[PDB]
Swiss-Prot record:
Gene: mle
Protein name: Dosage compensation regulator mle
GO BP annotation list: axon extension; chromatin organization; determination of adult lifespan; dosage compensation by hyperactivation of X chromosome; dosage compensation complex assembly; male courtship behavior, veined wing generated song production; positive regulation of heterochromatin formation; positive regulation of transcription by RNA polymerase II
Upper lineage: Eukaryota, Metazoa, Ecdysozoa, Arthropoda, Hexapoda
Major subcellular site: nucleus
Originating species: Drosophila melanogaster (Fruit fly)
Domain Helicase C-terminal, residue spans: 345-519
Residues binding ATP, per UniProt: 124, 126-129, 477
Keywords: ATP-binding, Chromosome, Helicase, Hydrolase, Nucleotide-binding, Nucleus, Repeat
Length: 864
């Protein structure tokens, strides 16, 4: 049965003496192995109240002024702007030509009569950009300008930011006067009365803590993606409208049978908004190879065979085609591979586009982030497509920093065709500029939750009928356009109808944390009140996981309460590891590791076609053999280069193969997490950065304890290397080390320790684990474990699949010490300002854990 050979490990007598002394000081039990609804408050607009911050103003102004005076001021200012601004006149002329204007008055009537109204219409017809302004202008011109307050919940950060900027531009002003936005890392707030605040749904859910006192309209945009946050918000607003009859809620959808939504809200009006127009032609893989005369490069086929023999060691719809097509067409179609994307095919497509000499920017729905930057660097390398003359390739996503959003959104002269590389965030979303050409690869990266309770996996899966229809409709927008769908006709015939609602394929622990943070009641009842309740077993699994490891005020009853790990914008496990790092004084390293582990961006840029990092990107990890350590060192010295001259910052980014966007994302997330810990009560003095000297070969207390807390925070992602690129994950499941990690090599390379912890598992072609870090057996025994047992021949069983050789009393001592760590977390949470001045027994526990989590602490008497 290929029994795993136990890893030899011993500790010095002084260490075990410290263990028994600390377990006697703590006096923990040892073994000889482990022992309602509050309807969020709402109130009409009231003087001396700031709606967005939910607190009384009490400042120099807005104190002795009634709402009516402000309404009169707003009305007079609006008339002045109408009668004095020519730009405003031109923008009004432009707004009066949209289809929404033809229904404008009608729309208002519904909002003035029914508390909830759904607005169904085509994307790009002017719903999010026009409805809020219509409501606000109606309220201002009606003499009630100060009585209006409009939240607009956009689905993603980039959508909210871009739509807020566009709305501000349409009113000939700047952000923060009457239109603002509030997304993660970035909040620009408008004036207290008569303003529009574009905020993402999660930001609104967090703002719900203090209540929506003073909000008159809430506009949930893009309800048809059916993400879990939108469903939470829909339930919340349903109860809010049921209790408060004066609140106005407007839901917006594009392509769905809105009958279900109408039935959900007790039969609410659904207004059908006329579709502007614009035709689109759809050509498939068959027609593409026919009119481009593509020759599938057999040399690249041999390369693909060589690079795919890996998975081969341990039904295709590309082979099916109708007889109307030529023999060469079907032969080349068969030669192509469905799973991978042929970049030579994309260059043939771009050749066809340039040959058509029809102007207009093109946009491509690339599968995923890695593929987006791979195509980025490939196109930048080519000559005809990639030079700054007549062409430029620009990426779009939510996680990219704001710096590139400005340059992609802003228009360019001479018509350089603006090749946009986007994820699926551009179908029912911002719509950017004019589009005439839509190239869809029919692939999308999705967090494919394999039901169960844990082991979050990610996979690139085929899109759906509705997504493809939306992407085809995204072609017509400035000139009749064309849609090149890169798949066979049989593949489209085999695509699923609609993608499943997100609630059925996401964990619900954060959902329940947010539910109980706002005092909404029992999780089961609240989830049963949703549109489509999630499967019950998922609810019990999430609740039992939350009732398991706690860094909160949670307990064991129907009202356990909850604080922290929910207001922290990170998964509860990583927040728990953050708090533990704040206890040990290594909060900075843990924060940056969490920021890198919660982001899908890659730390290292790989050239066009490789299997690993050749020498210099591997040199950063050095003797640690980990991506987290190399990531940390790269981030510090990148910060150094950025603090000094920007030129060498960029030059270094290119020279060591690091990505500026990735470093900026991890840096911003690290500072946000450190701040949100600061306001939680943890002093700054334990968050001082510790420089990581990778050159030191051996003992390093801060780095070793950081890897230990990583083992704690990434449970149950622990794997054992066997040979070459093969590792075993839980239940002894085979997996291959990701080619991007530093632990991958084509030579017969052996590691000092075989235990690794990995961030995510990308199932693009096979089970592949990325974000790898090698950890000693003691770290796995302490932190990266949950089940400890004694097997035959005095062999310790860890997680029922890991074999260890150790004295049973020592393993029992560590197992009893784990509840001591839990109680330390609870004590630190009780008084966050007293975490480095603890009781003497807890100080001893921290000291012994620090001395025990050392890299070389488990090699006593072993040459290794
Ligand atoms: N952030 C932006 N910057 C510049 N132009 C935009 C922006 N957002 C949308 N547009 C353009 O303005 C037009 C109005 O679209 P919009 O009403 O925002 O679409 P929807 O309301 O369906 O999201 C669109 O055709 C789009 O090309
Ligand atoms: F109004 Al939309 F996508 F339909 F922003
Ligand atoms: Mg838009």
């Amino acid at each position: 049965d290929e029994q795993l050979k136990p890893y030899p490990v011993k500790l010095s007598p002084n260490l075990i003496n410290k263990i028994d002394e600390v377990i006697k000081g703590l006096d923990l039990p040892v073994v000889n192995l482990i022992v309602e609804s509050s309807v969020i408050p709402w109130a009409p607009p009231q003087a001396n109240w700031n709606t967005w911050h939910a607190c009384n103003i009490d400042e120099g102004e807005l104190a002795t002024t009634s709402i009516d005076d402000l309404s009169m001021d707003y009305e007079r200012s609006l008339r002045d702007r109408r009668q004095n601004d020519n730009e405003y006149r031109q923008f009004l002329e432009f707004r009066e030509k949209l289809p929404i204007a033809a229904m404008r008055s009608e729309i208002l009537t519904a909002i003035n009569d029914n508390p909830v109204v759904i607005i169904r219409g085509n994307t790009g017809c002017g719903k999010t950009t026009q409805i809020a302004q219509y409501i606000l202008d109606d309220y201002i011109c009606s003499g009630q300008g100060g009585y209006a307050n409009i939240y607009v919940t956009q689905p993603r950060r980039i959508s909210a930011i871009s739509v807020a900027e566009r709305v501000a531009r349409e009113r000939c002003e700047q952000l923060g006067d009457t239109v603002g936005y509030s997304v993660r890392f970035e909040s620009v707030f408008p004036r207290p009365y008569g303003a529009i605040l574009f905020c993402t749904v999660g930001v609104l859910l967090r703002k719900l803590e203090a209540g929506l006192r003073g909000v008159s309209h809430i506009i949930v945009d893009e309800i048809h993606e059916r993400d879990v946050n939108s469903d939470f918000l829909l339930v919340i607003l349903r109860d809010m409208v049921d209790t408060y009859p004066d609140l106005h809620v407007i839901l917006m959808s594009a392509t769905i049978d809105t009958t279900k939504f109408s039935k959900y809200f007790g039969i609410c009006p659904v207004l059908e908004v006329p579709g502007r127009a614009f035709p689109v032609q759809q050509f498939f893989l068959e027609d593409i190879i026919q009119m481009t005369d593509f020759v599938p490069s057999a040399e690249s086929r041999r390369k693909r065979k060589e690079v795919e023999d890996e998975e081969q060691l341990l039904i295709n719809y590309n082979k099916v085609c109708e007889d109307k097509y030529s023999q060469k067409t079907r032969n080349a179609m068969a030669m192509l591979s469905e799973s991978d994307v042929s970049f030579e095919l994309l260059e043939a497509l771009l050749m066809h586009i340039k040959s058509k000499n029809i102007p207009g920017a093109i946009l491509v729905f690339l599968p995923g982030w890695n593929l987006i930057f791979a195509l980025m660097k490939f196109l930048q390398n080519t000559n005809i497509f990639g030079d700054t003359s007549q062409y430029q390739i620009l990426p779009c996503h939510s996680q990219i920093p704001r710096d590139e959003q400005r340059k992609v959104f802003e228009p360019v002269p001479e018509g350089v065709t603006k090749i946009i590389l986007s994820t699926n965030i551009a179908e029912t979303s911002i719509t950017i500029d004019d589009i005439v050409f839509v190239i869809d690869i029919c692939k999308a990266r999705m967090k494919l939750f394999t039901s169960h309770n844990n082991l979050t996996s990610y996979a690139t899966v085929w899109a759906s009928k509705t997504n493809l229809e939306q992407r085809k409709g995204r072609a017509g927008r400035v000139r009749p356009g064309f849609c090149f769908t890169l798949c066979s006709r049989a593949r489209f015939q085999a695509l699923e109808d609609n993608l499943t609602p997100e609630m059925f394929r996401t964990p619900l622990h954060e959902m329940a944390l947010t539910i109980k943070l706002l005092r909404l009641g029992s999780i089961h009842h609240f989830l049963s009140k949703a549109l489509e309740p999630p499967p019950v077993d998922a609810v019990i699994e999430a609740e039992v996981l939350l009732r398991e490891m706690r860094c909160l005020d949670a307990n064991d009853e129907l009202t356990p309460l909850g604080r922290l790990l929910a207001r922290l914008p990170i998964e509860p496990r990583l927040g728990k590891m953050m708090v533990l790092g704040a206890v040990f004084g290594c909060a900075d390293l843990m924060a940056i590791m969490a920021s890198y582990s919660s982001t899908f961006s890659e730390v290292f840029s790989l050239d066009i076609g490789q299997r690993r990092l050749a020498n210099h990107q591997k040199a950063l990890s050095g003797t640690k053999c980990s991506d987290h350590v190399a990531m940390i060192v790269a981030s510090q010295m990148w910060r150094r280069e950025k603090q000094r001259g920007e030129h060498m910052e960029a030059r270094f980014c290119d020279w060591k193969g690091l990505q500026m966007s990735t470093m900026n994302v991890i840096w911003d997330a690290k500072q946000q997490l450190l701040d949100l810990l600061q306001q939680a009560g943890f002093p700054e003095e334990c968050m001082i950065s510790h420089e990581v000297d990778e050159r030191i070969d051996g003992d390093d207390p801060v780095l070793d304890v950081s890897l230990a807390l990583l083992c704690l925070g990434l449970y149950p992602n622990i794997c054992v290397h066997k040979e070459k690129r093969k590792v075993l994950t839980t239940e002894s499941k085979a997996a291959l080390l990701h080619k991007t990690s530093v632990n991958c090599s084509n030579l017969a390379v052996t590691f000092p320790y075989p235990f690794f912890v990995f961030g995510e598992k990308i199932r693009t072609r096979a089970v592949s684990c990325k974000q790898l870090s090698m950890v000693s057996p003691l770290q796995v025994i302490l932190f990266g474990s949950r089940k400890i047992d004694l097997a035959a021949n005095n062999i310790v069983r860890v997680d029922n699949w890991l074999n260890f050789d150790i004295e049973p009393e020592l393993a029992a001592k560590i197992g009893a010490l784990k509840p001591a760590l839990e109680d330390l977390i609870t004590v630190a949470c009780d008084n966050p300002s007293d975490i480095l001045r603890l009781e003497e027994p807890y100080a001893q526990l921290v000291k012994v854990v620090k001395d025990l989590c050392v890299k070389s602490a488990g090699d006593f008497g072993l040459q290794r």
